[PDB]
Design a protein around this ligand. Structure first.
Ligand SMILES: CC(C)=CCc1cc(/C=C2/OC(=O)C(c3ccc(O)c(CC=C(C)C)c3)=C2O)ccc1O
Ligand SMILES: Cc1ncc(COP(=O)(O)O)c(C=O)c1O
Lengths: 410, 410
């Protein structure tokens, strides 16, 4: 062919971006976009955290800062603060100094860096055959990230039960005890994307017990710590429980939501090891993978987080901005459930409030979604997931009535 | 109960990291560090460009900017001016709309995204066997970035002539004539790393002749445009010549040096093809590569470069800052050759001024380097490479006399 790129086709457009594209093209005056992948205020507007705007002003006014290369592993003060946020100041793994932190480009970078390491140094030398497990519907790119690291056997475990509209613990635990030993399990630390339903502490202890005696490697995805329920301790309970149980694991931390710094790509890959020497060996090889991916991480976003977490006055204001987004999400969840039960909508709806975080599995079948999209012009994925921050005091009456209508018919 | 990281070897530091580490531990007060990987002033300090401090203020005073996800490919205004800076305003490829741009994490990210694409869609699907050609002394991560993409045959072409201390034109062109067709050739667009010696335009016209006669894919590495010569049009002549000759190529752009934004990771992958439809399809397939690497690029660094290249008043302040760095390096080279020839040092030394950029091959053998490090405490690589910006007017007289001893005594 004349062009070198002639035999290359147009990539498959991701399903949620096509949803947003069709939304902004729908001329209906009652259109609702519940498929936005970020937090939106009650006025359908993005929200820059006031703590972020204040910290950014001081960074802009700080001549102590140059623009020289950060270390390969990233900004030190951000790395220690990010892992202390997930593990806690009183973590025994920190006192024993068996913790490492690689600054990442959001959670996606931490998942890629961790998967690249596992596909090279874990369960043998370049063992691409290690099974990797994901949830019923997981994050759309969990499969793609581990597939890019070379893993050739990506499996799924039961998580969300459509009929009970909740967690399928027996399907989860039986898929775990049937997994080959030393398999990697991708675990949502809190705020399950996209279901929103999380295991209880007494359910996590059962999930952890299976992975312990089968040597299943936990890979935590902590993308909404604090942002989900408004409590930093409760959102990190599963991570810290695995710490007390002596687990070795990676934990992909994201600060795009609890800080609202989506476009600055602030992430951390926390590593917990048996020995302090094992961490310096892991961080030794993380540098080689970073070097060939992004040579070193950006500084602006990580500087915002490190200043916020290490300063007690700005840490208090940040938690105030976090509870703002969590309480509004909590309010929108309860307002929708109250409206749906007031109209006498068939079926159970306590899962609307049992789930947490920004995303929620509404529990409707694909063709009930098409009614909401085509007839009522409420845009959501056929998966049945909505963005709770997409609900407002203005559209709650129209959305709740439409969901009622979608379940009346069909 | 051993650890899963128990057999992970402790990775050793790179040679450049050990050189700086040994330097700041050296107690001799005459020590000169010529191995810093960034621009340094006459006072051995980093330099934040004055236009960058001003643009950082304007961005902080812009309450309109949010922190929502940039497009997968990046900020459109940055990709607009980044590629426009490399190809020229009145470039035919731009007015014919056959140019694409991917915002990347520095030039290293642009190389990685480009290498990942070529390993999947170039010269067949998933062809990991297309030979990749690099300079015989090359930037070390070139082999590492393309190896991480999966290319199993990384080749070298003759470049640095140690005896004549210049460019081996006949060794370069001979290795390209014997290169297998459709082979990828990584080309330094300007200021070769680490030699600093560049092909003349008439030398570039012979390189482009062989690459066209054998369908060799050019992967340009433009990491010092403006920073090297002070002239943006001269530093991009080879790239713009390949456009006029009808080449399809990649060009990994870096803004770490000409803007001094090392730790903001500002890069761009310029794609030049024959048909505009294929270019869009290439950018789509690169979105899938990006979103599994870093989900989307950061905003701060790209905003700084975009505001600078978009506003004409800020554009000249930048070229004035660029001229300062290029002129100081030009003067440091000129005085180094002057003192060396004044001291009647054996051999030719016009290569110090014939080279361009802040990296120079001094023409010393590894044992002449050992004398400089051991007996004179001047820290440079065994290759003989020095950072010319590590030379100051207060140590230049001591370095030139030190180089004179090493060649007369060893
Ligand atoms: C500083 C530059 C741009 C050097 C030359 C150059 C750059 C690129 C692309 C890059 O973009 C970047 O940001 C970095 C980067 C990141 C970490 C780092 O330690 C160094 C220092 C390495 C040196 C100075 C040899 C550079 C790149 O390595 C491709 C080819 C090149 O020859
Ligand atoms: C479950 C999950 N994992 C990973 C990510 C990636 O986050 P980031 O954009 O910061 O990389 C997201 C989004 O926050 C997510 O929801």
């Amino acid at each position: 062919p004349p062009s070198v790129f002639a035999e290359v086709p147009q990539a498959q457009p991701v399903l949620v971006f096509k949803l947003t594209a069709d939304f902004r093209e729908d001329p209906d005056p009652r259109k609702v976009n519940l498929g936005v992948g970020a937090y939106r205020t009650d006025d359908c507007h993005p929200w820059v955290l006031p703590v972020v705007k204040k910290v950014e002003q001081k960074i802009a006014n700080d001549n102590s800062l140059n623009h020289e290369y950060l270390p390969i592993l990233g900004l030190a003060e951000f790395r220690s603060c990010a892992s202390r946020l997930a593990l806690g100041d009183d973590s025994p793994a920190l006192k024993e100094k068996r913790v490492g932190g690689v600054q990442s480009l959001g959670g996606t970078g931490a998942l890629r860096i961790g998967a690249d390491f596992l596909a090279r140094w874990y369960n043998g030398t370049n063992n691409k055959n290690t099974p990797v497990y994901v949830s019923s519907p997981t994050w759309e790119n969990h499969n793609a990230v581990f597939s890019a690291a070379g893993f050739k056997d990506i499996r799924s475990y039961r998580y969300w039960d459509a009929e009970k509209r909740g967690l399928d613990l027996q399907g989860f635990l039986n898929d775990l005890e049937n997994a080959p030993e030393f398999s990697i399990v991708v675990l949502h630390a809190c705020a399950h994307n996209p279901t929103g339903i999380d295991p209880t502490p007494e359910q996590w202890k059962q999930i952890a017990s299976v992975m312990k005696h089968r040597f299943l490697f936990p890979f935590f995805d902590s993308a909404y710590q604090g942002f989900a329920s408004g409590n930093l301790e409760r959102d990190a309970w599963a991570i810290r429980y695995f710490v007390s149980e002596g687990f070795e694991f990676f934990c992909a931390q994201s600060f795009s939501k609890n800080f609202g710094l989506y476009n600055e790509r602030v992430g951390n890959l926390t590593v917990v090891g048996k020995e302090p020497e094992s961490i310096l060996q892991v961080l030794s090889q993380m540098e080689k993978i970073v070097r060939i991916t992004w040579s070193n991480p950006p500084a602006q976003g990580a500087r915002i987080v490190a200043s916020t977490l290490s300063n007690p006055e700005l840490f208090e204001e940040w938690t105030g901005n976090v509870k703002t987004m969590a309480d509004r999400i909590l309010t929108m969840r309860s307002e929708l459930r109250a409206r749906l039960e007031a109209l006498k909508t068939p079926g159970t709806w306590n899962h609307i409030t049992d789930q947490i975080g920004m995303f929620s599995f509404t529990g409707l079948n694909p063709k009930q979604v098409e009614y909401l999209v085509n007839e009522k012009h409420i845009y959501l994925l056929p998966s049945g997931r909505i963005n709770v921050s997409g609900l407002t005091t203005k559209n709650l009456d129209y959305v709740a009535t439409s969901i009622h209508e979608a379940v009346t018919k069909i």
